[PDB]
A paper describes a structure:
The most prominent regulator of p53 is the Ub ligase (E3) MDM2, which binds to the transactivation domain of p53 through its N-terminal p53-binding domain, thereby inhibiting p53’s transcriptional activity. Furthermore, MDM2 catalyzes ubiquitination of p53, where monoubiquitination promotes nuclear export of p53 and polyubiquitination leads to proteasomal degradation. ATM phosphorylates MDM2 on six residues (S386, S395, S407, T419, S425, and S429) that are close to the C-terminal RING domain and far from the domains associated with p53 binding. Here, we show that S429 phosphorylation selectively enhances MDM2 homodimer E3 activity, but has no effect on MDM2-MDMX heterodimer E3 activity.
To better understand the E2–Ub recruitment mechanism of the homodimer, we determined the structure of the human MDM2 RING homodimer (419–C; referred to as MDM2R and hereafter superscript R indicates the RING domain) in complex with UbcH5B–Ub to 1.41 Å. The asymmetric unit contains two molecules of MDM2R that form a dimer, where each MDM2R binds a UbcH5B–Ub molecule in a similar manner (root mean square (r.m.s.) deviation of 0.16 Å for Cα atoms between the two monomeric portions of MDM2R-UbcH5B–Ub complex). In the MDM2 homodimer, the last three residues of MDM2 (Y489, F490, and P491) from the second MDM2R protomer are buried within the MDM2R-Ub interface and pack against the Gly35 surface of Ub in trans, whereas in the MDM2-MDMX heterodimer, this is fulfilled by the last three residues of MDMX (F488, I489, and A490). A major structural difference between the dimers lies in MDM2’s residues 430–436, which precede the RING domain. These residues are not involved in crystal packing contacts and are cradled by the N-terminal region and C-terminal tail of the second MDM2R protomer such that residues 432–436 adopt 310-helices in each MDM2R protomer. The helices stabilize each other via hydrophobic interactions involving A434 and I435. L430 and P431 adopt an extended configuration and are stabilized by hydrophobic interactions involving I435, P437, P445, and F490 from the second MDM2R protomer. In the homodimer, N433 forms hydrogen bonds with the backbone carbonyl atom of F490 and the C-terminal carboxylate of P491 in the second MDM2R protomer, and these residues in turn form hydrogen bonds with the K11 and T9 sidechains of Ub, respectively, to stabilize the closed Ub conformation. In our structure, there is no electron density for residues 419–429, indicating that this region is disordered. Our structure of native MDM2-UbcH5B–Ub complex shows that the MDM2 homodimer is an active and competent E3 in the absence of pS429. The MDM2 homodimer utilizes the RING domain and the C-terminal tail to arrange UbcH5B–Ub into the closed catalytically active conformation via a mechanism similar to the MDM2-MDMX heterodimer and other dimeric RING E3s44,47,48.
Author numbering:
A (entry chain F), F (entry chain C): 0 to 76
B (entry chain D), D (entry chain A): 430 to 491
C (entry chain E), E (entry chain B): 2 to 147
The structure:
C-alpha cells in the first residue's frame, strides 16, 4: 500500500490510499467517493498519456508519491 | 475539512462559493450563485461532473 | 474574464506544470502562446509543439480558441493547426483551465480518434499500418518540433 | 468568504460540513451528511432557520 | 455527544457571554452547573441564579435538561426550578448550545408568558398588579439570589 | 452610520452597518440578507433582554461596536 496524489479538475490536490495492483478503474472509484465525479467522466493522465481502466498502477510504473492528473472525458474528432 | 471551500468562485474568481450545483442527491460547490445561475439558465451541465443541473441552491454557512 | 485569466496565469507561475506551459504574448492578456512536450514513448517524444490561445471576452463560459502553430502529424489535428476536439466545442466546461486543456490535448496525441477524423488520409494510414503512421509522426516531430 | 466553512459539523464536531440542508432555493451548510440525514429522517426542521427540510444534498467542494 | 460537549466547554472557558457561565460538576461531562446574572433594570437585577444541566445520551439531537436550583419568582418557572420554555421541548434545535440556551432563558426572565403560565398564581398577579409582581420578584431575588 | 456585531446561532460573529435610528426589524432584515434566517425566527438579545421589533437601536442605547446576541425565536409557557 502507498499514497498517490491526484490533481483534480480545479487544481485541488487530493491523496488516495492505493496498492500497486489497483487498476485505474479502482482508482476512479476512489476518486468518485472523494469527489463525486462519475468514473466515465474521469480521464486520468500520467507522463502525458491517458490511463486505461483495465491496467494497474504497476503497469504504468506509478509509484508511491506519484501525481496523476485528472481532466474531463474527451474525444478527438 | 475542505480547505479550498473558502477560496473564490472558480469561474469568476470574484465572489464566494455560495452557488451549489445540485444533481440528484449530490452537489458540487465551486462557483458563486451568480455564475451557477447562469449555467442553469443556459441549461449547461455541471462543470466538474457533467450531470444535468437540477437546481442551484444559494448556500449559507451558519 | 480578466480575474479568471489572471488567476490561471498566477497559478501557472506558482505551480508550473511539467508537460505544458503557457503565458500571454506581449501585454495582451487575451492572447497567449503555449508549448506541449511530446509524450515519452511516443513518436512525438523530444518534440516541443507551440500553440496559440485566444480567450473570448466571455471566457470561461465560452471555450478558448486553441490552434497549433507547430506542424504535427495526427488524425484529429490538421496541417493548418486546427484541432478537432470535443472539449474545445460542445463538451467544453468552464472548470477547464488552460493547463487542463493543454494536458488534455497532450493526451489526445497518443489517443487519436481515426473513426471521426479531421484528416481522413492520416486516419486511413493509422488504421492501415500503425507502424507507418508512427514513422511519419516521428519524422514530422524531428523536422518541425525541434 | 466563509471562513467558518472549514470547521467541523456543529452537531457532532467530528466530520466536515458536507450535508447541505435545502429548503426552497436556499441551503444552510453547517452539519455533516450523517447528522443532517438524521434530522431529515426524524422530520426535524432546519436547525438554524426552522424551515422544513426538503432534502439533504451531499456537498462536494471541487 | 462528548466531542460536542467538549467543544462547548472549550468555547465557554475562553469566550462566555457577560451574562451566563457554565461548566461540568466534577468529572461528569454530562452534568453541568450554570449561572445567570439577573438583567439590569429588572426585578432580578443584582441576583445571580444557579442552574443545573443534564445532557442526554443523544445530545444535541435531544435537548439538555435545564432547571434552576435558585428559587425565582416568574410565571414560567416552577417551585422546583423547572422552566416551561418551548426551546427546551418541541422547539429545540441541535444548533442551540448551552450558552445560547442560558442567554435565551435570561431573556425569558423579563419577557414572561403570563397567558399560558407554569404558575397561574404568579401570572395572575403579573397581569392584574404588575408592581406587586415586581415587588415580590425583587424580594425573592434578595432572599435567594444574593 | 456605525458598525455593530451580531453573534449568530452557531457562535459565528458578523458585522452590520447600521444607524442608531434603525429599528430592530431593519437589523433583522440585514441579518436575513447575510444569513438566510427569516426575521420571525430571529430573537436578538442585549444586556440580557430581548430587543423588540418596533424600537430603534437608539431606544436601547446601543452604541457603536456593540455586540448583539442572536438566538432562536422562543416562547415561555
Ligand atoms: Cl435554479
Ligand atoms: Cl473579471
Ligand atoms: Cl434527503
Ligand atoms: Cl462523541
Ligand atoms: Zn462566480
Ligand atoms: Zn456535479
Ligand atoms: Zn455531524
Ligand atoms: Zn435553514
Amino acid at each position: 500500500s502507498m499514497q498517490i496524489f491526484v490533481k483534480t479538475l480545479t487544481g485541488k490536490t487530493i491523496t488516495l490510499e492505493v496498492e500497486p495492483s489497483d487498476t485505474i478503474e479502482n482508482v476512479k472509484a476512489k476518486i468518485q467517493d472523494k469527489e463525486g465525479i462519475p468514473p466515465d467522466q474521469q480521464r486520468l493522465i500520467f507522463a502525458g498519456k491517458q490511463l486505461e481502466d483495465g491496467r494497474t498502477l504497476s503497469d504504468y510504473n506509478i509509484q508511491k508519491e506519484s501525481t496523476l492528473h485528472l481532466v474531463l472525458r474527451l474525444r478527438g474528432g | 475539512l475542505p480547505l479550498n471551500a473558502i477560496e473564490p468562485c472558480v469561474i469568476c474568481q470574484g465572489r464566494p462559493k455560495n452557488g451549489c450545483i445540485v444533481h440528484g442527491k449530490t452537489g458540487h460547490l465551486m462557483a458563486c450563485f451568480t455564475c451557477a445561475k447562469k449555467l442553469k439558465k443556459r441549461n449547461k451541465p455541471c462543470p466538474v461532473c457533467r450531470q444535468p443541473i437540477q437546481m442551484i441552491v444559494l448556500t449559507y454557512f451558519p | 474574464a480578466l480575474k479568471r485569466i489572471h488567476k490561471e496565469l498566477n497559478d501557472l507561475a506558482r505551480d508550473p506544470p511539467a508537460q505544458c506551459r503557457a503565458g500571454p504574448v506581449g501585454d495582451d492578456m487575451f492572447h497567449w502562446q503555449a508549448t506541449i512536450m511530446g509524450p515519452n514513448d511516443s513518436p512525438y517524444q523530444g518534440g516541443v509543439f507551440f500553440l496559440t490561445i485566444h480567450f473570448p471576452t466571455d471566457y470561461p463560459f465560452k471555450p478558448p480558441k486553441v490552434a497549433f502553430t507547430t506542424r504535427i502529424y495526427h488524425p484529429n489535428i490538421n496541417s493548418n493547426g486546427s484541432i478537432k476536439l470535443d472539449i474545445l466545442r460542445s463538451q467544453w466546461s468552464p472548470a477547464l483551465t488552460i493547463s487542463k486543456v493543454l494536458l488534455s490535448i497532450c493526451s489526445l496525441l497518443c489517443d487519436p480518434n481515426p473513426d471521426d477524423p479531421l484528416v481522413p488520409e492520416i486516419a486511413r494510414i493509422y488504421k492501415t499500418d500503425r507502424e507507418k503512421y508512427n514513422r511519419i509522426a516521428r519524422e514530422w516531430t524531428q523536422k518541425y518540433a525541434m
